[PDB]
């Protein structure tokens, strides 16, 4: 039973590690839109991403 | 007899002995007299010469994998330039493996190999071929000393008689954009009407010749003069510490079975390469090095 | 041609075969031995010759000292070869040599003086009209129906591997190795002395050779087979000697041929037969490698051990490059194939220009064979 | 009289415990050792190339300590863990040291998208590692390398905090790392791309050393702007097959599978009287 | 049985949550259609569209459809494994009884005395 749940540990941590890599990749690039309207649109999109990450903090 | 299958390697540079051991097995004169409905005697002879030039370029280490290309002209009545297929290593090149293509890159002879040719890599040679009807052999080379010479601001300097023998050098600046037809126009402008040596800045060194021996002579002189310049311009550190040879004064004072101006080195290294065992079938100006014993 | 058929005479190092060209079977196959008496003969009227040749010599093994005229593929007694040729022509076939052409086979790499001496002997004494010399390994591929492939040959003299490319024998890639059947027989004695059975005279060498012929096989895996032989006695078999005694060979059955694959057992520093074939293909150019791996023919007397085919295939697969076409083509009649190839070659109409006339030899001496036959 | 050793020893071993794709990766990294030995870059084992077998099972393959790069084969490779524990040992009777794996271990902990890490100690790359403004893109090959990251190296990374600084300086997306006074490190998803980048950066460093010697100053050189510089074949797919094919022609038993055939192999001339082939 | 017992139980526990899930999903699609009715925003600040949600819903439905058959096969195999085992148990017990009783009667050895 404990070896089975260890192999579940490995299989579970695989997705977490791949996701950490993937949002590393997408927060790496920076492309701000021109002028204040697009800048604040990017700001609220960032806040959407920040609210999204707190969901998987629970899974971690 | 009593020879190893692969030659033992030096502490540095195993490529020389390794390509030697490969050329021990693979002959460069792949043609032995089979059916060839499109080949000519001159075409076959130039194929052998081009394969031998490829192997010689590999042997001196004047090669950067497969990213350099050497083209020749069949001198038929329309187009038909010979180029190495894209993918084969230089020690793998044989006579029948060479690929005949058109000026714009259309493959007229697929050759003995399934590998296609690089369409992007032929446009640089096609610009020179469209620029001059006189040119017949184009060699593009990449040595680290030549790259260091091309990367500096002043470029080649008249410090050796070999650089004086090079003559006027055309310079092509590194655009790095590959803008096709206007890039060809800029090549035609920088190369000029008459020139022997082109330096494509930060990338490579190009020799153009009416014959294979002429291009080999020009590129050998260029490479040796470049590596002459590398040490002495490093040690000098300025014009106050370097003697420059006067070109005009030196050239004014310095000047059939008979050899051409560049056939001597080609024939000597062909003798060397046939003594190695490459069996190139090159027509020598004199069949024996010395007289037969009596 | 129609009236007279060329004589096909195969001179192997251990056996000699003879027949008529265009025929399926050789007429006479006999051992190539010559025996001399070793004891004083006291019976006045029973009749004792000075020397016995061939099967008559092998019938009376107990009173003779058997000598082989061919040693390691090199002739060491030329008048002895005159005796064996006289016995072949006059007794076995009962045909005159002056009325028919003869065909001779030879090792791929032999000294020039050997060819000159064979030509001089065949023209000067036997007065044959026409003769020709052929390479032994080439004719096997003709018998195979092939013109391109690698031929491995192993007789009582020497074992050599050659490549053949549309009938051309490449001289540089021909490889030689001194692992013959006679050395295997000597090693069979050397390993039989462990059990307690002692053989020392040249008469018992034929008994040991018969034991080798009848009771041997090649292990697919040596390490597993030694453990199998140590575990159980199901591998042991019994042989019945000419004097009535019964011996149990047991473990040694797959130890006799193993000297072919690992020559370190015999003290030789050379490589195995599989490495020899691999290096022989390695020495040729790249273009013909694919049709040499895809085409391999085994021939010779030694290559009839049971299980040699699969072991050879596995050992040459282990050295070949990946996804490589590997196949071994061993005919069942693989040690009569040289005579078959010789008769086939003599049967053709365009072969008749190969014959060397008596006038040509008389004009150009014994050295004409090398110029006429390349 | 020969250095030539069959690089594929998987059939003669017939042992060990293997993954479903492990036996091809072993041959590939053994071939990478053979290429880096042949060019004269390295001779003495210092844990140069490391490969990750699987995303989940870890079990990274490294070279044993003490075996020179000429003598490394497929069966001689050692499968170790992320910390240094021995997961599986091949047929190599040598003492096991995983000290050099520590340099690759935190990079494994940092980026998963890399499988192949190649560390160099060549004199040109170590001179560039001591070159304080780093690689100056004055040549085409250095432009082909891409972006670089620079990290100070104190020679030790067993410490728990040094790993954080290393993965901080590496960045989220950067595949070339330059440790100061310690050569260079190249980072690749495949061994082919990593080997291609190693070759190109080595050529660029060799060009740059001669350029800085000959010029004597930055102002004597020309530097094209990084902004101005700014079927499908993968970055190292095309060249690596040619190298494997050439080693196969020489005779090394390279287990690398070729994606397309070399020669057409026109059908030969067939006779009916052939004995049927094979031994079945 | 008992592991597959409790796994059947928490499977039907998961269906009760699936009902809440599809109630929330159709509530969200009605709200998205209400948003889409006025001046057609697809997704103003989020990557998520309606068709991605429909796709992942279909994907989840397909996997639960496969896993109910997987659990059916597992429970069928487990019960088929006990049925012949507990057939074997009573036959073994009767074997033990008769062999011990008959061998004990012959172990007493009173057959040779009373005759
Ligand atoms: N049926 C057989 N089984 C095993 N070995 C055999 C058999 N026949 C012949 N041999 C071996 O082959 C040898 C004879 O080889 P042979 O074909 O005469 O050589 P050559 O090619 O010189 O004629 C003998 O020493 C014998 O050991």
UniProtKB/Swiss-Prot annotation, chain C:
The modification Methionine (R)-sulfoxide is found at residues 43, 46. CDD domains: ASKHA_NBD_actin. It comes from the Eukaryota. It catalyses: ATP + H2O = ADP + phosphate + H(+). Coiled coil: none annotated. It is found in: Cytoplasm, Cytoskeleton; Nucleus. Keywords: Acetylation, ATP-binding, Cytoplasm, Cytoskeleton, Hydrolase, Methylation, Nucleotide-binding, Nucleus, Oxidation, Ubl conjugation. GO terms for biological process: adherens junction assembly; apical protein localization; axonogenesis; cell motility; cellular response to cytochalasin B; establishment or maintenance of cell polarity; morphogenesis of a polarized epithelium; positive regulation of double-strand break repair via homologous recombination. ISGylated. Its EC number is 3.6.4.-. The keyword Ligase does not apply. The modification N-acetylaspartate is found at residue 1. SMART domains: ACTIN. Actin is a highly conserved protein that polymerizes to produce filaments that form cross-linked networks in the cytoplasm of cells. Actin exists in both monomeric (G-actin) and polymeric (F-actin) forms, both forms playing key functions, such as cell motility and contraction. In addition to their role in the cytoplasmic cytoskeleton, G- and F-actin also localize in the nucleus, and regulate gene transcription and motility and repair of damaged DNA. This is Actin, cytoplasmic 1. It comes from Sus scrofa (Pig). The lineage of its organism: Eukaryota, Metazoa, Chordata, Craniata, Vertebrata.
């Amino acid at each position: 039973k404990l070896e089975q749940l260890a192999r579940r540990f490995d299989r579970k941590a695989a997705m977490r590690e791949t996701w950490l890599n993937e949002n590393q990749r997408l927060v790496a690039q920076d492309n701000f839109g021109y002028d204040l309207a697009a800048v604040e649109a990017a700001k609220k999109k960032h806040e959407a991403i920040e609210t999204d990450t707190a969901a998987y903090e629970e899974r971690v | 007899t009593n020879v190893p299958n692969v030659y033992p390697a030096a502490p540095q540079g195993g490529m020389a002995a390794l390509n030697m051991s490969l050329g021990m097995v693979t002959p460069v004169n792949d043609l032995r007299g089979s059916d060839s409905i499109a080949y000519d005697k001159g075409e076959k002879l130039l194929r052998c010469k081009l394969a031998a030039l490829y192997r010689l370029a590999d042997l001196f280490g004047w090669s950067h994998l497969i990213y350099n290309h050497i083209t020749t002209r069949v001198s038929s009545e329309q187009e038909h330039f010979l180029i190495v297929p894209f993918g084969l290593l230089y020690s793998e090149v044989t006579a029948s493996s060479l690929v005949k293509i058109n000026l714009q890159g259309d493959v007229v002879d697929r050759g003995s190999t399934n590998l296609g040719v690089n369409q992007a890599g032929f446009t640089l040679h096609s610009a020179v071929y469209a620029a001059r009807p006189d040119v017949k052999c184009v060699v593009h080379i990449h040595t680290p000393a030549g790259a260091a010479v091309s990367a500096m601001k002043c470029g080649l300097l008249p410090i050796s008689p070999e650089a004086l023998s090079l003559g006027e050098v055309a310079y092509h600046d590194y655009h790095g954009i590959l803008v096709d037809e206007e890039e060809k126009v800029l090549i035609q402008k920088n190369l000029g009407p008459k020139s022997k040596v082109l330096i494509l800045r930060n990338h490579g060194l190009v020799s153009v010749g009416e014959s294979v021996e002429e291009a080999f002579y020009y590129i050998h002189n260029l490479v040796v003069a470049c590596e002459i310049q590398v040490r002495t311009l490093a040690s000098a550190g300025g014009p106050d510490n370097l003697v420059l040879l006067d070109p005009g004064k030196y050239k004014a004072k310095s000047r059939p079975p008979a050899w051409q101006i560049g056939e001597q080195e080609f024939e000597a290294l062909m003798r060397m390469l046939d003594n190695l065992g490459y069996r190139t079938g090159y027509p020598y100006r004199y069949p024996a090095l010395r007289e037969k014993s009596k | 041609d129609d009236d007279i058929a060329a004589l096909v005479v195969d001179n192997g190092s251990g056996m000699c075969k003879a027949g008529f060209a265009g025929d399926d079977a050789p007429r006479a196959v006999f051992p190539s031995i010559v025996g001399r008496p070793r004891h004083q003969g006291v019976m006045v009227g029973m009749g004792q010759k000075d020397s016995y040749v061939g099967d008559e010599a092998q019938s009376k093994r107990g009173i003779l000292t058997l000598k082989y005229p061919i040693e390691h593929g090199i002739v060491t007694n030329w008048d002895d070869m005159e005796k064996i040729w006289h016995h072949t022509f006059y007794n076995e076939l009962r045909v005159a040599p002056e009325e028919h052409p003869v065909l001779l086979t030879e090792a791929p790499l032999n000294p020039k003086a050997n060819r000159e001496k064979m030509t001089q002997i065949m023209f000067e004494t036997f007065n044959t009209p026409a003769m020709y010399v052929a390479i032994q390994a080439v004719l096997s591929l003709y018998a195979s129906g092939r013109t391109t492939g690698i031929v491995m040959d192993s007789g009582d003299g020497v074992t050599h591997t050659v490549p053949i490319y549309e009938g051309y024998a490449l001289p540089h890639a021909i490889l030689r190795l001194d692992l013959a059947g006679r050395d295997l027989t000597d090693y069979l004695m050397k390993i039989l002395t462990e059990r307690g059975y002692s053989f020392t005279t040249t008469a018992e060498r034929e008994i040991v050779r018969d034991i080798k012929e009848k009771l041997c096989y090649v292990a697919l895996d040596f390490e597993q087979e030694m453990a199998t032989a140590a575990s159980s006695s199901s591998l042991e078999k019994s042989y019945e000697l000419p004097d009535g005694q019964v011996i149990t060979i047991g473990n040694e059955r797959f130890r006799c041929p193993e000297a072919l694959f690992q020559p370190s057992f015999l003290g030789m520093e050379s490589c195995g037969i599989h490495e020899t074939t691999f290096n022989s293909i390695m020495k040729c150019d790249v273009d013909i490698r694919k049709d040499l791996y895809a085409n391999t023919v085994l021939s010779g007397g030694t290559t009839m051990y049971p299980g040699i085919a699969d072991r050879m295939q596995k050992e040459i697969t282990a050295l070949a490059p990946s996804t490589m076409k590997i196949k071994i083509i061993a005919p069942p009649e693989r040690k009569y194939s040289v005579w078959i190839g010789g008769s086939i070659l003599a049967s053709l109409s365009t072969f008749q220009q190969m014959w060397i006339s008596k006038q040509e030899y008389d004009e150009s001496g014994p050295s004409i064979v090398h110029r006429k036959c390349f | 009289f020969s250095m030539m050793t069959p690089i594929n020893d998987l059939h003669t071993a017939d042992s060990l415990n293997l993954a479903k794709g492990e036996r091809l990766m072993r041959c590939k990294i053994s071939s990478v050792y053979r290429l880096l030995d042949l060019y004269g870059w390295a001779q003495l084992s210092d844990t140069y190339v490391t490969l990750r077998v699987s995303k989940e099972q870890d079990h990274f393959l490294i070279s044993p300590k003490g075996v020179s790069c000429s003598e490394v084969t497929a069966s001689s490779l050692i499968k170790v863990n992320i910390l240094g524990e021995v997961v599986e040992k091949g047929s190599s009777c040598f003492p096991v040291d995983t000290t050099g794996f520590c340099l690759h271990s935190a990079i494994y902990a940092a980026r998963p998208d890399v499988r192949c890490i190649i560390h160099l100690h060549t004199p040109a790359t170590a001179a560039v590692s001591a070159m304080k403004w780093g690689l100056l893109p004055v040549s085409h090959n250095a432009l082909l390398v891409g972006d670089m990251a620079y990290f100070d190296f104190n020679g030790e990374m067993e410490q728990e905090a040094d790993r954080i600084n290393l993965q901080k300086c590496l960045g989220p997306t950067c595949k070339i790392l330059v440790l100061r006074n310690h050569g260079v490190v190249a980072l690749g998803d495949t061994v082919e791309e990593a080997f291609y980048k190693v070759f190109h950066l080595q050529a660029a460093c060799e060009i740059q050393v001669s350029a800085l010697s000959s010029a004597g100053g930055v102002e004597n050189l020309i530097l094209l702007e990084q902004e101005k510089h700014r079927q499908k074949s993968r970055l190292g797919e095309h060249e690596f097959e040619a190298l494997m094919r050439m080693l196969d022609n020489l005779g090394y038993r390279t287990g690398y599978p070729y994606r397309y055939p070399l020669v057409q192999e026109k059908t030969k001339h067939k006779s009916e009287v052939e004995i049927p082939a094979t031994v079945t | 049985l008992d592991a597959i017992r409790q796994l059947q139980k928490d499977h039907e526990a998961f269906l009760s949550s699936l009902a809440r899930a599809q109630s929330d999903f159709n509530y969200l699609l009605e709200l998205d259609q209400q948003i889409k009715a006025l001046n057609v925003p697809s997704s103003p600040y989020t990557w998520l569209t309606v068709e991605a949600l429909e796709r992942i819903w279909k994907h989840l439905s397909d996997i639960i459809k496969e896993r109910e058959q997987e659990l059916e096969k597992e429970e069928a195999r487990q019960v088929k494994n006990f049925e012949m085992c507990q057939e074997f148990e009573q036959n073994a017990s009767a074997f033990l009884n008769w062999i011990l009783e008959t061998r004990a009667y012959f172990l007493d050895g009173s057959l040779l005395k009373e005759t």
